[PDB]
C-alpha cells in the first residue's frame, strides 16, 4: 500500500502533451500511459511517464487493446537512459474512473507488484488538484458478498525537483503572483479550503439526492460513513467549549496587541529617522 | 592464413579500442 504519492510537473506536462498528441492524431476522449518513479519510504514519487498505444470501445467495457510489448520496450529503453526511474504505475486522462481500470491495473501489476493509478484530468479545474491517485485492493465485504478488486484512494499531491521547480517557476514567471504576503496567501488558502469543503458537501448532497430519488441503490458502507461524519460534527455552544474558545482567543489577541504595539513603535522610529534625514538634507542644501 | 591474420588484427582492434576509450577520459582532483 502507498498512503502518499507525489506527481511532478514533468509528468503533468507529458500527460497533457500525450492527450494533445492523441487528440490531433484522432478522437479517443482518453489516453493511457505508463508512469515511472521512485519508492521513497511509504511515499511514491512518480518522476516521469511515457505514452503507450491504448484503445478501447465505449459499450462492451471489455474491448480494449493495450500494447504491453511497446510498454516493456519503452520501459527498458528509459531504464537504459535513467536507472532509478522504475515502473510505478499508469495514468489515464479520464475525467473519472472507468470499468476497464481494474483489468488495466492487473495488466500493469504484471509489471509492478504494487501499481498505483493516477487519473490526471487534463481538463482545467478550479477547486482541486489535477491528479487523483488510486491503488487496487481486495474488498472483503462484511455482508458476505464475494471479495472483488476495487480502487482505493491514496493522498496525491504535486511536488517538484529543484530543476523542475526552476523550470516551472520560469514558465510561470509572469502569471504566478508572489507579491501577496504570507498573511494574504494564508487567507486565500482559507477561502480556497472553504470552497473545497463546499464542493465535497455538494457532491455528497447530489449523491444523497440520487439515492433518495432512486437512481442509485442504497450503499450501506457510504451511509455508515455519512452518519459517522454527521455524528462527528461538534457542538460549539456547550458553555465550556465557549469558555475555552474565549480564553484562547484572548491569549492570542494579547500577543497580537503586543506585536502591533511593537510595530507601531518601530514605525515611529522609522518616521523619526526619515524626518531627521530630511531636515539634515534640506539644511545642507540651504548651506 | 587469413584466419590467424584477422584474429590477431581483431585482438589489436580490441586493444586499440580500449586505448581510445581510456584516452577519452580525464582525471579527477
Amino acid at each position: 500500500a502507498v498512503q502518499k504519492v507525489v506527481v511532478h510537473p514533468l509528468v503533468l506536462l507529458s500527460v497533457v502533451d500525450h492527450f494533445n498528441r492523441i487528440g490531433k492524431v484522432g478522437n479517443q476522449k482518453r489516453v493511457v500511459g505508463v508512469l515511472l518513479g521512485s519508492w521513497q519510504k511509504k511515499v511514491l514519487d512518480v518522476s516521469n511517464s511515457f505514452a503507450v498505444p491504448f484503445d478501447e470501445d465505449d459499450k462492451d467495457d471489455s474491448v480494449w487493446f493495450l500494447d504491453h510489448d511497446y510498454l516493456e520496450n519503452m520501459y527498458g529503453m528509459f531504464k537504459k537512459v535513467n536507472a532509478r526511474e522504475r515502473i510505478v504505475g499508469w495514468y489515464h486522462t479520464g475525467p473519472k474512473l472507468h470499468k476497464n481500470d481494474i483489468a488495466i491495473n492487473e495488466l500493469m501489476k504484471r509489471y509492478c507488484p504494487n501499481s498505483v493509478l493516477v487519473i490526471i484530468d487534463v481538463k482545467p479545474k478550479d477547486l482541486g488538484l489535477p491528479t487523483e491517485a488510486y491503488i487496487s485492493v481486495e474488498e472483503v465485504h462484511d455482508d458476505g458478498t464475494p471479495t472483488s478488486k476495487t480502487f482505493e484512494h491514496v493522498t496525491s499531491e504535486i511536488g517538484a525537483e529543484e530543476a523542475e521547480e526552476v523550470g516551472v517557476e520560469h514558465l510561470l514567471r509572469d502569471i504566478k503572483d508572489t507579491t501577496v504576503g504570507t498573511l494574504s496567501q494564508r487567507i486565500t488558502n482559507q477561502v480556497h479550503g472553504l470552497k473545497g469543503l463546499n464542493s465535497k458537501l455538494l457532491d455528497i448532497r447530489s449523491y444523497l439526492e440520487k439515492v433518495a430519488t432512486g437512481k442509485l441503490p442504497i450503499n450501506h458502507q457510504i451511509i455508515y460513513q455519512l452518519q459517522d461524519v454527521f455524528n462527528l460534527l461538534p457542538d460549539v455552544s456547550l458553555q465550556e467549549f465557549v469558555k475555552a474558545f474565549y480564553l484562547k482567543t484572548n491569549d492570542q489577541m494579547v500577543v497580537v496587541y503586543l506585536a502591533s504595539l511593537i510595530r507601531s513603535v518601530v514605525a515611529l522610529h522609522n518616521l523619526i529617522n526619515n524626518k531627521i534625514a530630511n531636515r539634515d538634507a534640506e539644511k545642507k542644501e540651504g548651506q | 592464413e587469413l584466419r590467424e591474420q584477422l584474429k590477431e588484427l581483431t585482438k589489436q582492434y580490441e586493444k586499440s579500442e580500449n586505448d581510445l576509450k581510456a584516452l577519452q577520459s580525464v582525471g579527477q582532483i
Binding site: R21, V166, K176 | -
Partner: protein, 287 residues
C-alpha cells in the same frame, strides 16, 4: 543566407525535460535530441526532447547512438509525434552556455544530415526559479570567416539577445558559432497545472495548528521579543550619539534588534491572526 532573426521556440515540456536531464546527470554533459519542425526560414519549434543513454563517462558528448535514436523515433511516431530531429541539446552544469570542441564537432555532424539542426546548451546549475540559463547555437563556417563574410543576415533588430556573456565570447562565440534567440510557447493550459503546483488541499487550508504548540511558539517568540526590546533600547540610545560608523559598520557581525523585532512581530502576528480566523470559520462551518 541565415537571418539574424531566427527564433527557437522551446515548449514547456521540452524545457522541463532538458532541466530534468541536467539535474539528473551532473557534471556529465548529458545529451539528448530535440524533436520539432522548421516551420519556416526564421522559426524552429522544439516540441519535445528525449535523452540518450549516456554510456559510461560523459564529460564529453558521446557520438549519438543511432540504434537508440532510431528506436526512439519509431516508437514516438507509433505513439504520437511524427516529427523529425531539429537538433541536439546537452548540459553544461555551471560552465555557462558555450560550446566545446567536441560539441562543435557533433554539431557539424548534425548539420551534415540537416543544415538547420540546432545545438541547445542548458545550464541546470546556473538556472534559478524564474530564469533558466539556456542558449541555442549553430556553427560559423571557417571558410566564410576567413573569406570575409558575416554568416548572419541582419534584416531585423533582433540581435540584442543579452550582450553575449564574456564566458561565451572567450569560449568561442561570434567566431566559430553564433547564438540563436530562444522563446517559449504559452498555452494557458499547461500553465494551469504548473500553477496547481504548490497548491494545498482544503484539509491544510482549514486545519488548525496544534494549540499547545501554538501557545509554546507564542511564549518563546515573545521571549525573544523581550530580549530584542532590551537590545533595541540599548541601540536607539547609542545610535544618534555617534554616526561615524553607524552608516554601515555598526551592525555587521552584531544583531540588529529592530530588524529581528520586526521579523518576530511579523511572524507571530501572521500566525495568530490566521489561527484566530481559522478557529472562527471552523466554529461556524462545523457546527
Amino acid at each position: 543566407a541565415v537571418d539574424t532573426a531566427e527564433q527557437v521556440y522551446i515548449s514547456s515540456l521540452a524545457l522541463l525535460k532538458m532541466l530534468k536531464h541536467g539535474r539528473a546527470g551532473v557534471p556529465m554533459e548529458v545529451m539528448g535530441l530535440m524533436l520539432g519542425e522548421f516551420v519556416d526560414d526564421y522559426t524552429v519549434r522544439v516540441i519535445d526532447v528525449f535523452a540518450m543513454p549516456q554510456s559510461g563517462t560523459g564529460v564529453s558528448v558521446e557520438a549519438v547512438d543511432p540504434v537508440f535514436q532510431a528506436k526512439m523515433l519509431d516508437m514516438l511516431k507509433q505513439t504520437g509525434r511524427p516529427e523529425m530531429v531539429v537538433g541536439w541539446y546537452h548540459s553544461h552544469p555551471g560552465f555557462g552556455c558555450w560550446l566545446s570542441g567536441v560539441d562543435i564537432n557533433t554539431q557539424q555532424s548534425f548539420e551534415a544530415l540537416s543544415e538547420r539542426a540546432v545545438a541547445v546548451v542548458v545550464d541546470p546549475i546556473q538556472s534559478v526559479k524564474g530564469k533558466v540559463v539556456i542558449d541555442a547555437f549553430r556553427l560559423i563556417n571557417a571558410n566564410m570567416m576567413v573569406l570575409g563574410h558575416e554568416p548572419r543576415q541582419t534584416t531585423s533588430n533582433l540581435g540584442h539577445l543579452n550582450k553575449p556573456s564574456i564566458q561565451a565570447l572567450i569560449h568561442g562565440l561570434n567566431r566559430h558559432y553564433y547564438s540563436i534567440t530562444i522563446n517559449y510557447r504559452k498555452n494557458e493550459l499547461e500553465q494551469k497545472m504548473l500553477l496547481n503546483l504548490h497548491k494545498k488541499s482544503w484539509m491544510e487550508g482549514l486545519t488548525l495548528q496544534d494549540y499547545s504548540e501554538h501557545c509554546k511558539h507564542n511564549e518563546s517568540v515573545v521571549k525573544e521579543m523581550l530580549e530584542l526590546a532590551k537590545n533595541y533600547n540599548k541601540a536607539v540610545e547609542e545610535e544618534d550619539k555617534m554616526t561615524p560608523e553607524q552608516l554601515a559598520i555598526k551592525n555587521v557581525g552584531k544583531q540588529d534588534p529592530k530588524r529581528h523585532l520586526e521579523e518576530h512581530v511579523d511572524v507571530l502576528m501572521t500566525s495568530n491572526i490566521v489561527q484566530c480566523l481559522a478557529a472562527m470559520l471552523d466554529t461556524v462551518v462545523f457546527k
